[PDB]
Design an enzyme around this catalytic site. Structure first.
Site: not given
Ligand SMILES: *Sc1ccccc1C(=O)NCC(=O)N[C@]12C[C@H]3C[C@H](C[C@H](C3)C1)C2
Length: 148
Positions: A62, A126
């Site tokens: 984060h 994030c």
């Molecule tokens: S930043 C955050 C914080 C808490 C929960 C979820 C998230 C978030 O945004 N995660 C989703 C994410 O990054 N998905 C991915 C899916 C694929 C392609 C990208 C890089 C990785 C593999 C994570 C985005």
């Protein structure tokens, strides 16, 4: 002596040390699955596989707001041509921040993921976090490819 570490569930142990000289970062990485609690305490892997021997290492974290006590608070300084040292026990794996960009929320499929990759650490930092509503205005994706 030491040896090649494994990835346990316990968040008290340290499997790898994330060290970025450009950002003065020298923080322990908490091995295991991603849990909402731990991701507010430090950085943990997004990979469910206990293998840090794999070439795809996804780690989640984060951004910084009022608290400089986040392990990537000064990650703002590090450039796309800096050095990311992922130290596993004693072994120092150097990665370069070749792919840096902060993308928009909602779309997790902003990038197509596959098993045809190189040795890359895929860090999901994030750039926002409200635990109350469960929202983040930005996900800053940082992919560091292994250097020789
Ligand atoms: S930043 C955050 C914080 C808490 C929960 C979820 C998230 C978030 O945004 N995660 C989703 C994410 O990054 N998905 C991915 C899916 C694929 C392609 C990208 C890089 C990785 C593999 C994570 C985005």
């Amino acid at each position: 002596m030491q040896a090649k570490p494994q990835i346990p569930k316990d968040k008290s142990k340290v499997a790898g040390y994330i060290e970025i000289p450009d950002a003065d970062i020298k923080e322990p990485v908490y091995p295991g699955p991603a849990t909402p609690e731990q991701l507010n305490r430090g950085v943990s892997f997004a990979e469910e596989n206990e293998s840090l021997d794999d070439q795809n290492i996804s780690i989640a974290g984060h951004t910084f707001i009022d608290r400089p006590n986040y392990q990537f608070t000064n990650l703002k300084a590090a450039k796309k041509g800096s050095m990311v040292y992922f130290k596993v026990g004693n072994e120092t794996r150097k990665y370069k921040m070749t792919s840096i960009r902060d993308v928009k929320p909602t779309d997790v499929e902003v990038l197509d993921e596959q098993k045809g990759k190189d040795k890359q650490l895929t860090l999901i930092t994030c750039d926002d976090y409200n635990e109350k509503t469960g929202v983040w205005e930005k996900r800053k994706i940082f992919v560091a490819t292994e250097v020789k």
